[model samples]
Target: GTRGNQKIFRKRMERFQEALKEKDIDAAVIRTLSTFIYLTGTKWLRPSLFVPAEGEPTVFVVKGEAEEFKRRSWIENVVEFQKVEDLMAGVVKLIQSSGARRVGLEFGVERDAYLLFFKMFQRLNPTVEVVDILDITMGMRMIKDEWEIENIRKAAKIANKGMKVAEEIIKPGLSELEIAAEIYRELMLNGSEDPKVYVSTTPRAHAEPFRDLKVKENSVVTVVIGTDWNHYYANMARTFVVGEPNERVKKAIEVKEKALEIALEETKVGVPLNSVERKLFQFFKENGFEDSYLAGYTHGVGLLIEEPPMPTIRATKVAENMVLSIIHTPLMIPEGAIKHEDTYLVKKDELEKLT
Candidate 1:
């Protein structure tokens, strides 16, 4: 089955092209999977979408996939390439034909957008000056349109089901891997592709489920799941206790819950994210769990589980139509990582909690 809205994809391309013109970039060679899905309205393995600053875009798909790719995407100009060299030559030809001197390519860490590819393109076109177009792409992708929002909503609904499965199957003597397996099965049955399920019974902040690590009585089990529908993600995390929690754990949970409220009240349109982050940290200190609390108040969620506006790494402000995960800070105590995270749709007046 195919996914995507043609009008929405076209509008996104139009906006991206306009941004390219504004930035004086000649053309963009999109190789990153998420950005490729953003422009082409579908995911293609080793995909390439060539967008000339002034004209229509072209997609270089695998030799045998042009027919199926065309049906999945709205772009009409599809070029079939036999190999890696063929795809490179095709893009260089398009750039040369367009008389482009400055070409844009995403400087990303994904397998498709490798440093080798960037160097190859630079070597192929010696005269063409390559510039990073990450910000230009992220700027357009951070805000969600109606089509993207709808897909994210579907993903969130599936994530909720996966989390419920985690809660139901978690108990003493069960390995963390077993709980994660159940959650993964639930997410896949509910239409999630390449879902991420993290379960930790130990004190580690970010843990992949270990076969040796079994849940214990009165132990905290944290489950984090990222579910995707149509390549859009809705990430959520929850902490569960097998038996009765201790006083220290109860205090940490209380502080985390209050911090969640403060985060919601402080997060608004045009508000600096770091400002809200300061308040959250201050609250944790006032409650005596400052040492237990980790940084990172929230992060943007979309095609990527963790994208821009991640204030821990860079400065950013909250904006309308941005879907983010709130209260991402988890208390790493001797017991386990205590966390309460949910996806949110930031609106003008308030935020709509998706999970």
Candidate 2:
């Protein structure tokens, strides 16, 4: 169902261009991976795209890979840089050619790299001004159009496929890292682009890894699988037992399930993000498992696993077509403090589960 790859991406570029005009930005230097993909519909190494406020974009690429970028991207004016120094030189040229003294960097994602870029631009004859247009990019990214929505759905399915592979292959005597390889195999075979996976055996907590740990009967097998399809991403997580659940285990999953259910009731448009976060926060407290609530229990998931519009302690209203990953993780040590997460879409009245 994820069609219109070029058309949708170009439309996104059009939106970014409009943002440049509104921000009084003459041209933008887009170098970050996600923004590059969003603008050009292609992925390349060591290249730049200079976008004017109202016209076409010029994509700079390594001389060796220039032809391939032409086929990969939808834009014309693809420039080739032979030497490493030519990359930055080309960016300066684009700014000069456009007569743009004000330039915007795809902001909020790059830090060290921009310091290098900043030094270069600072030396320009006219001394170009720089702006961070993260608000524009993140705001547009939060709402998915029809094709983007479809691609996101495919990404969700691909992530579930990886998790399914993990659940089916996990058994006694297998190393936790071994299960990770199998999950990656399944996702790659399914035509996924990038898959970042996490695997841990029982008693091994999140942010704590025992790569050599092995699975056994009743071991809590937790797998967080995130995969990309057509450059869109889906993130999913599950924690379950290898054998029949014991009394305490059953009860733990029961509460997590209920807590997640309560959390889902709040993912609607016009609702404040903090309110949705607070409802989930209150669930553990009311259920007497307040201390078990874990970090990143809720967040926004998109091209990056966690993007803007993140439901933090501050206020940000949920928008239509926005996607979220509702994660309910119980931090009880003995039970392995399993996590359950799934992707959902924000609608007018309710949330739509994408995975």
Candidate 3:
């Protein structure tokens, strides 16, 4: 799947360079997949993009991959490396040759450019000052443009299809793994790339379907699906009941639906995410399900299924053009985890529902 608009890529680079100049950083070494695609407009493994403050950017790809990378991305300054040593040496040389004394790297949890690589880069260039630019990258990614929003919208449609499959196929005799497989099959055939399907038949907040876990009478199955189109993701979660529902499960469903409405109302352009979370917690306590309710109410969605503004992990206010997944927390009852979630595009006038 090839996706990229050259004008959009250029604008992103221009903004990044402006930020680098504002921060007084010489250059940034892009290593993460999301940022790489944001700048280069292509998805490549072992990504290395060197962006100087005021000059043309450079990309280092494995030998024989340069041609394909060039075809997929809008960047033209491509370098080929034959080995890991060569790649490291080339990176250091790019830094030294450019007279860059201060560089930025993302100390993220996703892919590489981790502690070991950071150490290696430091050892190779003993004088260069390395700074964590995770916030810088995330800040830009938090507010999506029109093109990115369109990609996420398409992904939401695919996620809706997968959820429909889950609803139609989930029954008393089907196993969690079976339902997950069927959902995944629908997603893949409908143009989702590397979709993530999680099915929980038990009381798990996050689960990979287990082969042995079969649906029983009155069982609650929670299916979470993340579908990606053009490297942008839309996340959705829904719970299905097999047979006659228990009193706890029915009450939990009613409370969750009302909570979803409150969550949507609280999520606006300038309100704080934690403020909405507090309101939710208060509502749950009033309903007598505080202990069973989880705290995190929302998370961001983009190139990564879950990203910044994760109120559970950090504190940040909601902003315009932000894509968020709400009602992420589930009611942990003995029957199962009861919850509902959908992706929404935060707008100045309204929070547009995507899935």
Candidate 4:
């Protein structure tokens, strides 16, 4: 499926170059792993994707990894180099060949990796300006195409299965690690390529393990798990009370579920990101559970867990087809906490819940 997805990849490049053109960028370079995967449709150890404004996009991989990349990537121009110096020289040539007076790049790379690319640019073309394309590329990455949505859907289905397993197998006397193991088994058996799980079976506020502590009758257990399918990720979290009782527990859950609904409601197309954040935070304040509210924000979810278009106090407009997850962590203190999170796909008029 990855071999010839050119049309999809082409559309991505087109949209990105449009963003670059707005900034008068000659060409764009992607150094981040997620961005590389998004453009190349395959993974590599440490690679780059060069997207020139007017020329064909190219992918650079290590010499040994070239065969698989050439075979898997939809882009026709897949280059390989064994030495970092050779790769940098080739990259410099590629950039200068485009007559890039102002080159676009993502500075959101690791320490040495970022320095390597920066120095290469400086050494090769002293006059050319380098622009940070973090916002531009990340914004482009936030919107999911049909193919990406399908992978996210598969991951969401696996997350739902994991949730079911957590509800059924978790009870008093079981440790958090033990609960994590059971959920991991179910997720792996059900097509989950990579699983990340955090389960709290004892009384706790922060999201940490219980060590040797065991579950109790009144232990408020919380489970947070995600499933990865072909590098696309979907996360789902829920809180379970060992023995059903009391008004406080039910009320906290009700507030949490309502908070999730409010989060979803404000995530529709064209809404301001910050306003959505206030609605959730303000809900907690109004409900008089201000201290119990840990933190809340909707994050882009696909290819990476917490990607872009974060719902914050900052200014941003929610767009159509942007994949996001409603995140809210509310603690009922020494009793335990409620960690409710689920993935959603933003639509033209409404939001579609994926998990």
Candidate 5:
């Protein structure tokens, strides 16, 4: 039970208004779940909301949830429909009635939804413009405001607590599935909502284990754990030695840690994202480690594990207030592998380690 507030919605609407003014669009349609939540501050059950450049914004909600939307939503204009056909007709009528010649459809709308709207609009007003509004929405989401950052920080704290539980429970002779269950249980007991845990054990530990599996006695097992609070996610990964790691595993761990250090050093505001990834991969290649198992070095983390500003070969740029996770791995033949991962917040001058 989170309280509904108008500040976030007001700020988001102001930004959208500015974008509309610049693009000269009459209205914008928001269909993404996360964006809808950000703008309205209501996690009410609804598929989409329509925002006009002028007048009150309209939220189209499913029939049963319409009353809830009207009660909770900060936006005054809300419409309800009983079925898919009714919803489509309502949306078309709303757009036409608003006298909008150009309607900005959400950039990431599913093909089916886009086609439905396209057909419906054509039947109603064939000349209405349908423009993509993804770039402007993405730009607004990339920069974290104070409230978003605070939510992320709380999510990190929950993830850290879960990691502590994992550190205590991981040991020899435990199956990967068993360990996963235990991790999830601990995360829930420690105040995690909808926790997800992934484990990689020694090859002998589990038959046909996925992703470079081969967890033997004295081998390193990597666990990537994520937990959510109010649908906001916090992610963390840690590697553990079942007994005592072999020399190769130990060396790989050291190198991987160093790689993380180098990557963090280069992830500053105004720095090119590609340069950081290039340097990380180069460090691995120079050390004679194969780059196959080690894919991208880092990626943005928020509502999802992989988000924008992916630290890959083709990433554009890194900006302040972007939350990212940096992962490093070392692979060797006839020997086990080691990995290190950490979540970081990009700042103006440095990187802030979340956990």
Candidate 6:
């Protein structure tokens, strides 16, 4: 079933080419898997595609993998390298042969690869300029396409299934690791490519203590499930009680939930990001709760659990179609802390909850 993902990739490529035109760059070289996948629909290939100012782009693959690239990728031109030495020389030669005086590079290029490529290209043509194209790539990915959004939704569904499993299996005698393992298994069974679980048994439990403790009665347990589909992640966190929650814990949960509600209410598109944080912070302070962590009320979520548009004093205005996770944590003495989180998609007139 074709979902027009490849068309989105083509549109993204057009945007990149326009960026190159704006910068007057002769060609761009992509190496990172995410960037490569954004350009080409295939994964698990070591690709170094050279997109020139004119004509078709040339994709370089390992000699043995060239046919695989041709079979899997919509990219037309494919070049092959026989050996390790040949691969290095081929990369340098391709850059020079493309007539590119300035070459754009992806962000995940390692230091060693950068230095090696620098020395190699210098030896080949010392006068050629190597420009970092990371910012341009980031700009392209900041906005999610329909396909990316669908994958995020699928990931959320998987995480929800895992959460249900945790709710059913988590008991007073079960260890935190055991509950975490069940959540992981449920996510995998529900089609998650990668699933991560973080569980805690007591109230006031940090990530570290969650990994080292056991479940007990009358304690609040927090479960965070991160599920991935096609390498994109959707994260969710929920807190449950072993039996019945105590008065203080119940109050903490109510406070955290209210804070989360306030944050979501104030997170509509076109609103100043600072205003959102201010509202959440003011709510806490007015309620006689000190903002100890200053962790902000929310953050963007997509390829990474925490991405851009973080709710802070300095963030720019929120934009429509952006996905963000709101985290509300409130703590008081003798009651421990309570944490609540949910992912929301920012819309022009309202907020859409994803988890």
The C-alpha lDDT values of all candidates are 0.88, 0.75, 0.89, 0.76, 0.68, 0.70
TM-scores, all candidates, are: 0.94, 0.87, 0.95, 0.83, 0.81, 0.79
Worst 10 residues of 4 by lDDT: 202-211
User: Which residue pairs of candidate 2 clash?
Assistant: none
**Model 3 per-residue lDDT tens digits across residues 233-275:** 9999999878888888889999999999999998987788888
Q: Write the per-residue lDDT of candidate 5 for residues 7-115, one digit (tens) a residue.
A: 6777788778779879989888777666676677766544477887876777888766767776776777777778877877777777778888888876553322456
Ranking by lDDT: 3, 1, 4, 2, 6, 5
Off by over 4 Å in 1: 109-111
Candidate 6 RMSD to the correct structure = 4.3
The TM-score between candidate 3 and the true structure equals: 0.95
**Cα deviation of 146, candidate 2, in Å:** 1.0
Query: What is the Cα-based lDDT of residue 147 in candidate 2?
Result: 70
Model 1, 295: alpha-carbon shift in Å?
2.5
lDDT of 4 by residue, 152-183 (tens): 88889989999999999888888888888888
Q: Which candidate tops TM-score? A: 3
Error of 3 at 179 (Å): 1.7
- Mind giving the per-residue lDDT tens digits that candidate 1 earns over 213-329? 999998789999999999899999998977998988887777778888999999999988889888877787888777886778899988888888788854668889999998776
Better of 3 and 6 by TM-score: 3
Best by lDDT: 3
lDDT of 6 by residue, 1-355 (tens): 2423566666777888989989988888776666676677666445566777656677777767878776777777887777767666766677678777888876443322356655665576676788878778756666787788888888888888888898888787788887887788888877776567778664443453345577778777788777877766787888876788787677667777788777877777778777877777776676666643355667666655655666542345788777777773435334344666776777788877787
What's the lDDT for residue 275 in model 4? Answer: 79
